[PDB]
Design a protein around this ligand. Structure first.
Ligand SMILES: O=c1ccn([C@@H]2O[C@H](COP(=O)(O)OP(=O)(O)O)[C@@H](O)[C@H]2O)c(=O)[nH]1
Length: 457
């Protein structure tokens, strides 16, 4: 006869903590990843600052994710330094308290891993200091991330005096990068060094991270992902957003109704993300282009940005018939993924934030690139010249993008034979995007590696 005990380690008895930096471009890929992990059966606790808790609570539906709030640690009114140092002190202690709370509880399994935003690398020390694994979630592509790595290593001169000559930078497994293709820190002026260090320091403890996760897929970034694979065991697990236990954004019904009433491939979707704020002159140039183009438009203009519009109680939305006989809608926020996947959307005029770029890739929507800072410039270079799914506008070579140049790009993407090829390329990358996260695809495999190895004794 036999006698003894069997212990089973399963996703249902495995507790994943996740902690995004409180900006939408960081929260959203983290949330999507939490949804996929919950679907595999894991217990998942999303930790987020109290000021983003409401936004996140309104978005998550059907249940599977356990939500915890922590203090903001900031007030958003101070300058970047201080807003950040207080921030790091505050969330270290509060996440540490959550970790210990769940180690001692009985409703949940003890935490086995903390998934933390890659720009908060000190959270690896919190995870290890409490005896649990640390997964660093990068929310930018491999290609721009490697540029930060090379910048941190201080081997090549990244200083730019662009006024006396033009520089082109060659890094391994990357295309030649002109000066305008480098991640853009000069916009931030005296805080350029601080923003820079934030992104560079993602790599301070790369050798010690238990899981390095990238919201990208291998085929999209083949050469550079492999390069990174040979140095670190990175796991490309993207897109974390679902293909065509979910996220519900506001104004979903409004935008879907409006788009349903347009013709297929008739709408330019315009958004500059959750953070960027364009000058009122830049808003003017974009306005006049969209009001004279041969297409309908849906333009997200955030509430705080309505004052920058050309034009006492800023409307939450505004409906238009344009000078070319088309229809426009300005709205404070939309379900961007549903919008990009709508048959009416012909192209995406974007600031080229990474989530916007990859959502567009996963939706097969070609792009007009109007990058503003950090990784957006590098993303635009890859969108136009590598993936060939969009066109980048030309600034005085920070410079204003004039309506005529915006119109140029709209006509190329939306009217020309070249535009038809960009669309074909975008549908191709969308299929590869789907294959990566389907069973046996590179991202499904890499995410299963993370999930399966979490169970090991
Ligand atoms: O009307 C909008 C505009 C943006 N987004 C989402 O907000 C995120 C923007 O992140 P991104 O990386 O593109 O740029 P960031 O906002 O960080 O500059 C993306 O997940 C978008 O889908 C949205 O849900 N509704």
């Amino acid at each position: 006869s036999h006698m003894g005990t069997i212990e089973i380690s399963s996703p249902s008895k495995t507790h994943i903590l996740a902690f995004p930096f409180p900006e939408k471009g960081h929260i959203n890929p983290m949330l999507h990843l939490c949804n996929r992990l919950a679907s595999k059966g894991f217990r998942v606790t999303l930790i987020t600052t109290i000021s983003t808790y409401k936004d996140v609570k309104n978005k998550i539906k059907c249940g599977l994710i356990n939500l915890e709030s922590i203090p903001d640690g900031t007030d958003k009114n101070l300058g970047m330094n201080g807003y950040f140092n207080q921030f790091k002190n505050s969330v270290t202690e509060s996440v540490a308290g959550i970790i210990e709370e769940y180690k001692l509880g009985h409703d949940f399994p003890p935490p086995k891993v903390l998934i933390y935003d890659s720009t908060m690398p000190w959270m690896l020390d919190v995870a290890h200091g409490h005896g649990i694994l640390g997964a660093s979630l990068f929310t930018q592509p491999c290609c721009v991330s490697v540029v930060y790595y090379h910048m941190l290593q201080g081997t090549i001169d990244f200083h730019r005096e662009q006024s006396s000559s033009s520089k082109v930078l060659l890094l391994p497994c990357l295309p030649p990068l002109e000066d305008r293709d480098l991640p853009e820190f000069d916009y931030f002026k005296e805080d350029s060094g601080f923003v820079s260090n934030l992104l560079l320091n993602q790599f301070l403890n790369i050798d010690k991270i238990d899981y390095v996760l990238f919201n990208t897929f291998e085929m999209l970034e083949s050469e550079i992902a492999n390069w990174m694979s040979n140095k670190w065991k990175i796991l490309t697990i993207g897109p974390t957003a679902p293909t065509a236990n979910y996220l519900f954004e506001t104004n979903t019904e409004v935008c879907m109704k409006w788009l349903d009433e347009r013709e297929p491939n008739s709408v330019i979707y315009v958004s500059f993300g959750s953070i960027a704020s364009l000058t009122e002159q830049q808003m003017e140039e974009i306005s006049q282009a969209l009001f004279t183009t041969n297409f309908n438009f849906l333009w997200v203009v955030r509430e705080e940005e309505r004052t920058k519009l050309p034009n006492n109680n800023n409307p939450s939305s505004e409906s238009f018939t344009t000078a070319a006989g088309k229809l426009g809608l300005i709205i404070n926020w939309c379900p961007q993924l549903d919008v990009l996947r709508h048959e009416s959307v012909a192209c995406f005029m974007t600031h080229c934030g990474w989530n916007s770029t990859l959502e567009a890739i996963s939706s097969g929507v070609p792009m007009i690139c109007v990058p503003q800072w950090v990784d957006q410039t590098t993303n635009a270079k890859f969108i136009q010249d590598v993936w060939k799914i969009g066109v980048r506008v030309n600034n005085n070579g920070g410079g204003l993008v004039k309506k005529e140049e915006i119109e140029r790009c709209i006509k190329e993407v939306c009217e020309s034979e070249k535009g038809k090829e960009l669309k074909r390329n975008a549908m191709k990358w969308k299929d590869l995007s789907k294959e990566a996260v389907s069973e046996g695809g590179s991202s499904d495999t890499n995410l299963e590696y993370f999930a399966s190895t979490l169970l090991f004794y």
